Amino acid sequence: VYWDLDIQTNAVIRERAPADHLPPHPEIELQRAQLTTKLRQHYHELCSQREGIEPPRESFNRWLLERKVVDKGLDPLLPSECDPVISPSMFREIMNDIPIRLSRIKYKEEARKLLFKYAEAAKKMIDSRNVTPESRKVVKWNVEDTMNWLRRDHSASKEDYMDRLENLRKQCGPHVASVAKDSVEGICSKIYHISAEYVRRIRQAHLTLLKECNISVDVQDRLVYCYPVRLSIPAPPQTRVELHFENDIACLRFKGEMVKVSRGHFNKLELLYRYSCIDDPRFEKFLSRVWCLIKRYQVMFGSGLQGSLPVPVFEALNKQFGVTFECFASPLNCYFKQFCSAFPDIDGFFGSRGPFLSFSPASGSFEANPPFCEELMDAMVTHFEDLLGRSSEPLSFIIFVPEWRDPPTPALTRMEASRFRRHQMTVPAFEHEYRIHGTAVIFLQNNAGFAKWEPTTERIQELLAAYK
């Protein structure tokens, strides 16, 4: 019992024309998977060759999210037409691991080794790369001072080694950053430009497949309850995808390539497809599409970027505040059968209303638990206030984000200063759901939304009780 697909939407939108996404097919999904693996490999080689580091953990996935905020290109997953070319997300994450990645410390000896490793790497940087005379002498002095300190007889504590590293990094940081800046920007640009080449290859392959199938690739005022994204281009024929179950795991094989999903999630997808798909009355295309869906999300992940909410919390959001819709979800993790998601081309068959920034409700009660991408969260806040100010119909958004204050994300600061904020509180932080400080819960509502779904004391109390 991890979802409630019986709850009907109360989201109201203007009727939309069907979307122009090329309809998914496992042949194309497999190629996109193989090229995205190669792209991650290029990123690994660039980080190693240019800066001697591993790719910062989760940075490639966060890059995909940031790029999609601005991407105007043709692929549902990979970026190809972005201004600016250099991702501020990837740049920021690589620079934080220069000249080395700081790892977790448990023991005094691990702290001493990390401090030495930092000092040694900063020295090799200054010895082997172009650096201004001012920056060179400052780093050289700090490295030499640290090595002299480590040379002393009587040893210090673990906390003293950690404090020495924090101070050393504070002094060297800006100088090391100035040495590596142009190199790091070059990694960000190159991986974007390789992505664009791969996107062109996938696009041509997908166009050629639809032509092989003899498939042609060539109202705003009416308000309706929301409905899944529909594709204007007819879908290609089903392909051969084989299903069998092993130990409650659904195994789907396309041309020898296997993907797996739990039996419970599989049965969920079958139900979402019954509720959401209108072009496949005999389920002939169902296994082809489930294979594409699982593969797409496996590729997106690559096998610390998002968190989920416990079922009793969604029950309380629906019962106390009328929530029927998730602004950020996937067919695999949604609680409601109506939600926005990253991949309209494949997720629409399973209930997706498309990406959130392209979704424009006039009314409804919503929950939002975005992935941890600062750029996406900032666009989300702008989108919230645009929608809340465009409509006088009841409109509410209940938003869950990490309570981070060192420094706070621009999104969290803007939401706390919003003219639509009706309430704010702290609930326990995101934890692993089986299916650091805390979680900020922010209520953004227009006048009509505040009248209909007011966060009264009793309603807030029942929502808090859903954690107890």
Ligand X SMILES: Nc1ncnc2c1ncn2[C@@H]1O[C@H](CSCC[C@H](N)C(=O)O)[C@@H](O)[C@H]1O
Closest CB to ligand X among 254 and 356? 356
List, as one string, the DSSP characters of 419-455: TTEEEEEEEPPP--------EEEEEEE-HHHHHHS--
Closest CB to ligand X among 192 and 356? 356
Task: Flag whether 406 is marked binding.
Answer: yes
CA distance 94 to 76: 25
CB-based burial label for 15 (10 Å; 0-12, 13-18, 19+): exposed
Report if residue 324 touches ligand X, rule: CB under 6 A.
no
- Number of amino acids touching ligand X (CB under 6 A): 19
Q: Assign residue 351 a region: left if phi > 0, alpha if psi is -120 to 50, beta otherwise?
A: left
CA distance 299 to 24: 15
Identify the residue among 59, 142, 320, 341 touching ligand X (CB under 6 A). 341
End-to-end CA distance of the chain: 18
Closest CB to ligand X among 63 and 356? 356
- Structural contact between residues 398 and 367, judged by C-beta atoms closer than 8 angstroms: yes
Minimum CB separation of residue 384 from ligand X in Å reads: 13
Q: Which residues in the 136-155 window bind ligand X by CB under 6 A?
A: none
Closest CB to ligand X among 64 and 122? 64
Strands, E, within 308-420: which ranges?
325-326, 361-368, 395-402
Amino acid at the residue 445? Q
Task: Flag whether 405 is marked binding.
Answer: yes
Q: Residues 136, 147, 160, CA angle at the centre, nearest 5°?
A: 115
- Structural contact between residues 346 and 285, judged by C-beta atoms closer than 8 angstroms: no
Minimum CB separation of residue 309 from ligand X in Å reads: 4
Task: Flag whether 430 is marked binding.
Answer: yes
Task: Flag whether 26 is marked binding.
Answer: no
Window contacting ligand X (CB under 6 A); options: 10-18, 49-57, 364-372, 457-465: 364-372
Report if residue 330 touches ligand X, rule: CB under 6 A.
yes
Window contacting ligand X (CB under 6 A); options: 45-53, 138-146, 227-235, 365-373: 365-373
Residue in the block written with tokens 């997720």: 347
Closest CB to ligand X among 107 and 434? 434
- Structural contact between residues 314 and 4, judged by C-beta atoms closer than 8 angstroms: yes
Identify the residue among 231, 342, 415, 444 touching ligand X (CB under 6 A). 342
Minimum CB separation of residue 283 from ligand X in Å reads: 25
Task: Flag whether 88 is marked binding.
Answer: no
Minimum CB separation of residue 333 from ligand X in Å reads: 5
Window contacting ligand X (CB under 6 A); options: 158-166, 202-210, 215-223, 339-347: 339-347
Identify the residue among 3, 328, 366, 450 touching ligand X (CB under 6 A). 328
Closest CB to ligand X among 150 and 357? 357
Closest CB to ligand X among 180 and 309? 309
Task: Flag whether 371 is marked binding.
Answer: yes
Task: Flag whether 369 is marked binding.
Answer: yes
CA distance 419 to 445: 9
Closest CB to ligand X among 352 and 446? 352
Q: Is the peptide bond before 408 cis (omega within 30 degrees of 0)?
A: no
CA distance 12 to 241: 37
Report if residue 369 touches ligand X, rule: CB under 6 A.
yes
Token code pair at residue 93: 């994450």
- Structural contact between residues 351 and 338, judged by C-beta atoms closer than 8 angstroms: yes
Contact map string, positions 291 to 320, toward ligand X, x by CB under 6 A: ---------------x-xx-----------
Identify the residue among 93, 326, 347, 375 touching ligand X (CB under 6 A). 326
The β-bridge partners of 14 are 223
CA distance 152 to 384: 58
CA distance 341 to 334: 9
Identify the residue among 334, 412, 440, 444 touching ligand X (CB under 6 A). 334
Report if residue 340 touches ligand X, rule: CB under 6 A.
yes
Q: Rounded to whole angstroms, what are the CA distances from 6 to 32, 275, 318?
A: 34, 10, 12
Identify the residue among 80, 142, 324, 333 touching ligand X (CB under 6 A). 333
Q: Which residues of 354-391 are buried (b: 16+ CB within 10 A; e: fewer)?
A: bbbeebebbbbbbbbbbebbbbbbbbbbebbbebbeeb
Minimum CB separation of residue 307 from ligand X in Å reads: 7
Residue in the block written with tokens 């800066």: 51
Token code pair at residue 461: 């109390």
Task: Flag whether 76 is marked binding.
Answer: no
Q: Which residues in the 49-78 window bind ligand X by CB under 6 A?
A: 65
Binding positions for substrate are 62, 92, 374, 404-408
* Residues at the interface with ligand X (CB under 6 A): 65, 306, 308-309, 326, 328-330, 333-334, 340-342, 355-357, 367, 369, 371
Binding-site entries for S-adenosyl-L-methionine: 369-372, 430-432
Q: Which residues are annotated as a binding site?
A: 62, 92, 369-372, 374, 404-408, 430-432
